[PDB]
Design a protein around this ligand. Structure first.
Ligand code: UDP
Ligand code: UDP
Ligand code: UDP
Ligand code: UDP
Lengths: 444, 443, 443, 436
């Protein structure tokens, strides 16, 4: 553990967990690692996860930063993660005192994409080689990467968007917010992509077989230094879960439902899947988030209904809250996965080879579904659209759930992805060799 | 894009730059604000500290200016004297600006520092912009000063500025016409170097000064950009609000004469006599000591105990810094008395307060004219120059009464208030221009 | 870039734009360029254009001449009074020219003031040149007007200039044929001052006007140099064609009537009706204000709601200024409707865009004649001087449909574009002269 | 107390002490007084006096000018001129002055200053009416004669001999002439002039200045002491009988050589006068002076230890002179001191070392205030015998007429000091003139 490295996730479970994963991974490869967190955390969950991680890994060290107050309405409405990410920039300078005192000077720092522009000054005064880890799809990341020239190019939204060395992305996959220049979200991505130039390398949670077209497209696309790190290894946070029912079930019989760290859909729609879930007869494990964005704000299982919970009393079990998704997904009993297609959830399923039913709700998740379908890892119906854009059928959903359980071709293809994913983590694997090579390059 | 703001001395110069800087930061530019020490007035120093603690990501660049060194520019004013001191030392900042870790894309300089600042970034890759504290109408007079000085052989009536109504000779300040005085030398020296500036920022909206903004555009300053009204950085802890809450809406008349303007000893007693005689409710900010806040160490021994007792029911007299923008927003204030320094004037317009115009020194008279033109307030030209003139209680009181009860003004003033709102809106020109400007900054 | 060159355009977009292009051309070819402008500019557009030029082309310096008060009577034209107010202050170029660092090796002056700078080129011996913005056939008529207006001054079917196709009197403006009008005096006097010039550049080439170049060479202008077509300057933008991107190639008709408004409102509406009948997809740039950018405040009141809605999915209208050269260059544009201002005509040939000719005033009719001879466009003679006649929509529609479907025209038009390039290419005849002129200039 | 006023002395206690008294006097008369001082101060004493003054008068404000980079006192007077502009900020921030009273030496520099920040200005002269005219008539005199004559005449003033006149002042080349001549020219700007004199002391002198174009001269003499109270010092003063003690002070700077000083020290014991002697080591600098009383010799101290006391350093002169014990004064005759003697009615012996003082000695003689020997002359020029001195020294103790003449002079001084008298009247009037 001669080399000293830090990783600095900003906000959100999707951002936070992987970086921890990168750190544990880095520690495993003889790196000395500090993990930087900024408080107060947006969600109760983020700290809960963080606390365990440090307890679980003593060798890795916690490096908190306390946030200063801010009040800017320029950011549209009130979504806390952009606000949290924005606040982090306001207090980012507070970082400098913290880095100056590090015992063995940091060889490199790994920084979440959202604040790559603020850190840059910090990265010139203290000359730290700075790296980034991408939580999104390489195909989706390819879109952001080419966004600035594409945003400069036109004023209206066309039928299909062409990123230069990649298959054109349908506009339906793209978020509205991305398209309009005036909107801030556009501002945050554009500036940050520019800051990539300063960075020594860019790391993404995907592997070359997995996104062959995109990774190369990125290569000639102005993102030369991108390294396919993924799939990010398990956090090894053992353990906090009781699953007597899961053990009883036959291997690959049970269906797992998670819509991500945040809730994805309306109750009326939600009841529709529950009704369709009954029609399918799949044994299930369902994790439900009452609060669409914050764990702290949810004190609501009223939404599914009284009759349904008793009706599926022996068919399935549901958790209202947080459960270990990878711990559950590695179980022999789980054979199908219905996800919101956040890239971390999609990547974990590919690593464990669990067939996916893609049900993207917002953001980059629609683009990840296209990768899920292109990979052959999962089944996706593009026509479902964004959440609340259309109300998709109980009867319609049931046919798709029945296909995932009884389509053997998906199982053979899903099995291949697990083998493809495993091979890249083997000593001869490009992903393991790239991580090992990057660690070798870090200076004393 | 890194932008640096270089305000000169004075809360009139200081307040606008910080306000914009906060606006720039809100809209996402990396912002640095340049301050130098010492500062003439306590408020500027106290304010800067407050502003930075409220806005953490804005960098503070502090330089100690060289000791006052001079020859020429007859100056009897402390704030103007400090401006000369900042201007003579701006050329020593070239070494510091060259090595800044996040290099500046552009500098937004103060009008007074524009000539020295333009020379400073000549061989550096930094765009030079200037923010104008005053009104657009005054800028037309500034542009015409060389023509005004050359063909000004006769002391008669007013001079017709080329694209708008002629200004009375009484409105032009006598100091502006004397080349020896600092006010004239600085105005002339800066206008000559305005052509080396990428853009000139102004605190007026297109609705407020359509003729003045248009006249300057065709008069050689073709890069003018209206961004007004500037928005408050809304940072404040001390509350002096309580008396007002007791007051009925619109009853109170607010009197203030800016950061560094004081009345005559005969005028303070005649103004006080008028406030009693009028019978109006009022809020008085008393700045008897003079410009500097530190030396104005007196504490209401200007009027005496007898007067406070008589007026306590209808008035509160405060000596010290008051949160002007907040007071103006209050339901209670239905009148304002102003020296018509532009920043007060803009605030009156944004918050729709009827204004009673009372110039004491410099641009105030022209701005007073603008205020009258737009219906914002009533101006009495005959009163002429405060500090050169004395007005009796009878005259003052009647005007005070008249402004409070002009419903046409209250209706008229509101209309300006609406227009100021529109411009800030995304459609509205002033915000749009800044949004237009901000993109430009990215290079 | 050793050689020091200054070009002076007096007024009008048509005069201003070509001169800027010549300036850019000179700098690219190794001259060091000063550009002289006279303010206040008649129009907002020249100023808009000039500021962008200097910011885009920053190695070229800007020399400005502030104009003095003028008052002569006998309202003519705003660009003709500005052309005569620049000659009332043309002695103000003396101080400026004497101060210039690398002294001028040659100055290029607009033809309107060649008689007034004659004296200035003797005192400071500047080899002076002039660039003509009209056609080579219309300059021939301009260059023989003095000798034609000595004989019986009247009108015949055709008036003839020495060695070129006789020009009809229907193409010649009526004010050029009366010797007591302003026009003639300025043309006669400036053609007399062409003998003091070292060269006379025109915006054309010899394939386009073979007879005019020799007619002008064998009639008193032996030092005439055709350096056409003038190259394009930069501008940096393009949020003008979101619809242009969606439209298919060569399918869009571009309607421009020049820097200024042309036809009467009643006439325009028939074209608008005409456009509709044709089905041509179109991009239309409408200038409401017939002569002044500043004066035009009309909007949707030119064509009516009725038309704008119906063509809503098939055409777009831009009011004011558009980057005409960039638009024409676009793959989408397939036809050009022009007032046949010469500068516009040379770019259409340069860009190979087919023309429907609707000359409105002045030299435009002769230019229309040139367009016909070249094979560049379709022209109807009988349409006449603008507002002389009212042209029915049906007649307008037919020519337009004919333009869309006329294959020989495209082939001939395509052929013209190749030739224009041929001249521009380094071996090229027009290219050769400009390169040569610089070689002559002495440091 | 409405009016607000400021004083500015550049250097020497010759000017500062009077100015402060001017400052205190002005405060008494209802004036807001600000005293402007120059730093660093040339002398530790000069610095010493200022701290005491503000501390003693709480209500008098102090404003200071820090200074940017021959005689130290003269050169510094020159330095203040360099930094005069520094004054400009100070005036601008003032809580504005109804008038400023400024030192004669730097009046020329300030003229520009007064005109921009409109302030009526005055100067106060610490030298005699007879001497001021010599400065006052000097500029014409230098150009017109350019020669050396036994005596020189100022228009309405009895001519005083060259012997009195300082040599340097005579030379056109010298720095001193430029300062004096230039400043008088600047004298035109001031709305008043003040000298530490009263008409009675020099009716002839005051008139000539009035005659000679110094129409605005105002004599406000004698200036009231600004003083500390109360210190139990000089138990050696209270002990002695009235008028038994001779107090010797050659200046606010040293004036004579150790051997020349030894002759007076030997003369003092022969004279028999009881004495309190203020002995300064530094010829011109208090900080420079680091010598003990070894110029007089150990022997002198043992012999006279009961008879008299020697103070090395500074003492409060007005405080000492006012004492009953003092009956004789020996003075270098600096005017400020001479005026103090007249107001306190203490007989003087005049031994002027340098400068204006010899002329000052002449005034004392016309007055009858003290006994003077002209022949002794400029200090260190000649050696004056111990035997010769005592006879004059004894004569000062035992002359009845002198006591009478001196008694009147004190009486005359008071009358002007009182409300009816002109010096008081003008002060009242000038303040009245002062406009808020
Ligand atoms: O109950 C839950 C919900 C989510 N996750 C983890 O949350 C991470 C982030 O999910 P993703 O990136 O797919 O989407 P997000 O929640 O950020 O929208 C993934 O590692 C999931 O395994 C988990 O472990 N348990
Ligand atoms: O007691 C005061 C006096 C002034 N101001 C602020 O100072 C600003 C500038 O004053 P202005 O430019 O109107 O006058 P000036 O001080 O420049 O003469 C105004 O917006 C006021 O809000 C204040 O907050 N409290
Ligand atoms: O909307 C316009 C109109 C004109 N032009 C250009 O400006 C010049 C004006 O055209 P021209 O002089 O031929 O016509 P006129 O000036 O006589 O009306 C031409 O070079 C055009 O290329 C342009 O860029 N945009
Ligand atoms: O030991 C001393 C010597 C002098 N003085 C004061 O010195 C002042 C001015 O002295 P003067 O100008 O007469 O002499 P100079 O300064 O020119 O030597 C008088 O007010 C004295 O009271 C004093 O207080 N103590």
């Amino acid at each position: 553990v001669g080399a000293h490295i830090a990783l600095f996730p900003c906000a959100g479970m999707g951002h936070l967990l992987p970086f921890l994963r990168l750190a544990a991974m880095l520690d495993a490869r003889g790196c000395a690692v500090t993990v930087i967190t900024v408080k107060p955390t947006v969600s109760a969950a983020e700290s809960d996860h963080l606390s365990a991680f440090f307890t679980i890994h003593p060798r890795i060290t916690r490096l908190e930063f306390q946030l200063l107050p801010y009040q800017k309405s320029g950011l549209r409405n009130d979504d806390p993660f952009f606000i949290q990410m924005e606040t982090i920039a306001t207090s980012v300078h507070l970082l400098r005192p913290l880095l100056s005192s590090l015992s063995p000077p940091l060889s490199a720092i790994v920084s979440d994409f959202t604040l790559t522009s603020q850190v840059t000054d910090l990265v010139s005064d203290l000359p730290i080689s700075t790296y980034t880890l991408m939580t999104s799809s390489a195909a989706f990341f390819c879109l952001m990467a080419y966004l600035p020239k594409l945003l400069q190019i036109d004023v209206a939204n066309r039928d299909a968007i062409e990123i230069p060395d990649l298959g054109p992305i349908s506009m339906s996959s793209i978020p509205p917010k991305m398209l309009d220049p005036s909107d801030f979200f556009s501002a945050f991505i554009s500036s940050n992509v520019s800051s990539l130039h300063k960075v020594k390398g860019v790391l993404i949670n995907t592997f070359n077989s997995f996104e062959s077209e995109a990774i190369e497209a990125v290569r000639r696309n102005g993102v030369d230094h991108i390294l396919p790190i993924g799939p990010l290894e398990s956090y090894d946070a053992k353990k906090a879960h009781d699953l007597p029912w899961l053990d009883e079930q036959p291997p690959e019989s049970v269906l797992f439902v998670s819509f991500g760290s945040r809730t994805a859909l309306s109750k009326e729609q939600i009841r529709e899947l529950g009704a369709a879930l009954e029609k399918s007869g799949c044994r299930f494990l369902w994790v439900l988030k009452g609060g669409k964005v914050d764990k702290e704000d949810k004190e609501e299982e009223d939404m599914l209904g009284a009759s349904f919970v008793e009706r599926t009393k022996k068919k399935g079990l549901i958790v209202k809250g947080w459960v270990k998704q990878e711990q559950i997904l590695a179980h022999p009993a789980i054979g199908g996965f219905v996800s919101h297609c956040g890239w971390n959830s999609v990547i974990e399923a590919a690593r464990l080879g669990v067939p996916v039913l893609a049900w993207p709700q917002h953001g980059d998740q629609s683009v990840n579904a296209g990768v899920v379908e292109k990979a052959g890892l999962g089944l996706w119906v593009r026509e479902w659209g964004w959440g609340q854009t259309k109300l998709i059928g109980r009867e319609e959903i049931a046919e798709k759930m029945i296909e995932v359980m009884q389509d053997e071709k998906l199982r053979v293809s899903a099995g291949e992805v697990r083998a493809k994913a495993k091979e890249t983590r083997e000593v001869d694997g490009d992903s393991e060799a790239l991580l090992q090579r990057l660690i070798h390059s870090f200076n004393n």
